[PDB]
Design a protein around this ligand. Structure first.
Ligand SMILES: CCN1CCN(C(=O)N[C@@H](C(=O)N[C@@H](C=O)[C@@H]2N[C@@H](C(=O)O)C(C)(C)S2)c2ccccc2)C(=O)C1=O
Length: 322
């Protein structure tokens, strides 16, 4: 009753998640929905119910990329209209390449096409501490404190010195492990334009004072850029919702084994905020080990993200902004 969960939104999330997990023949799926102004968890669901995926840890992969662009802008490595050389290259034999090859991309392009090359060149242009600092500001490598077992088990680098390959892979979301709850908190901080708040499972009266972790102007710039992910040419186009602008990012990660080996099992993500013009909600959707033939975030997680976010916007009577 001081519980923040809105059961209308919980039931919607559960139903859509159940359907997506079944359709993709996946092990499981999770969705976490957060009010970006208060940190209230409005919905939090695992499918199947007893697969406690919301508190399991995973490499966040390309979902970290918006923070990379924010950091490069803050440090003056790039400007709003910058164009990056995105030609694939090598680091000591390690090949850095994108799924789709481009010789150059704008910062919007880098997010739209999810360019590993583009973000890695940004990272190598900055000290190793730069992204460590930003990810930390957004709450990665800090526990969530909702009182759920597992909440605290994420892996985050405490390293003093970094190799070139480590710095690059960090920029596209490997070499650290986070829970869906931590990722939802990142995106809630994006939706607030740089105000960090802890997640709450209990009701609060707004406004809720938070911690300014990043300038409003920078976060707003990248939120606009993320709108391209949900338009034609963008990886998350299947999340698009009629009448609304959404700001999202897709991701796909190969699962790492305990000996550090990557296996042919996938984790698919879509994380974002809506409506993009003035965010009310942050949503993270994770689909664990899809087996039905598709495994990219845009194919597997983006459709259910659109169905959930669309249902939320309608239920909460949010004014169409498209
Ligand atoms: C550190 C070693 N190691 C770990 C494994 N690994 C990795 O799993 N790579 C994935 C990757 O690059 N992931 C995405 C970030 O999420 C990019 N965005 C995706 C999206 O938007 O869905 C995309 C369009 C599919 S590519 C990938 C690429 C292609 C297919 C599946 C997964 C690495 O690359 C990597 O170096």
């Amino acid at each position: 009753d001081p519980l923040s969960i809105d059961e209308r939104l919980q039931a919607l999330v559960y139903r859509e998640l159940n359907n997506a997990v079944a359709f993709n023949k996946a092990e499981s799926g999770s969705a976490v929905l957060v009010d970006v102004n208060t940190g209230e968890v409005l919905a939090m669901a695992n499918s199947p119910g007893r697969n406690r995926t919301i508190t399991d840890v995973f490499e966040p992969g390309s979902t970290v990329k918006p923070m990379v662009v924010m950091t490069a802008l803050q440090r003056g490595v790039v400007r709003e209209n910058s164009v990056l050389n995105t030609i694939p290259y090598r680091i000591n034999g390690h090949e850095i390449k994108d799924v789709a090859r481009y010789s150059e991309l704008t910062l919007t392009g880098v997010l739209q096409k999810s360019s590993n090359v583009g973000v890695s060149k940004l990272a190598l242009a900055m000290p190793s501490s730069a992204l460590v600092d930003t990810y930390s500001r957004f709450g990665l490598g800090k526990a969530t404190n909702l009182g759920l077992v597992g909440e605290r088990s994420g892996l985050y680098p405490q390293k003093q010195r970094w190799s070139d390959i480590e710095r690059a892979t960090f920029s596209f979301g490997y070499g650290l492990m986070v829970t869906p709850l931590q990722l939802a908190r990142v995106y809630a901080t994006i939706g607030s334009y740089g105000i960090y708040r802890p997640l709450s499972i209990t009701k609060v009266d707004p406004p809720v004072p938070g911690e300014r972790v990043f300038p409003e102007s920078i976060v707003r710039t990248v939120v606009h850029m993320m709108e391209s992910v949900a338009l034609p040419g963008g990886g998350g186009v299947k999340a698009a919702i009629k009448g609304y602008r959404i700001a999202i990012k897709t991701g796909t990660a190969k699962k790492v084994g305990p000996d550090g080996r990557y296996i042919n099992k996938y984790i698919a993500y879509t994380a974002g905020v809506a409506p993009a013009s003035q965010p009310r909600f942050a949503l993270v959707v994770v689909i664990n080990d899809p087996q039905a033939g598709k495994y990219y975030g845009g194919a597997v997680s983006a459709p259910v993200f659109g169905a959930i976010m669309g249902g939320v916007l309608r239920t909460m009577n949010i004014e169409p902004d498209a």
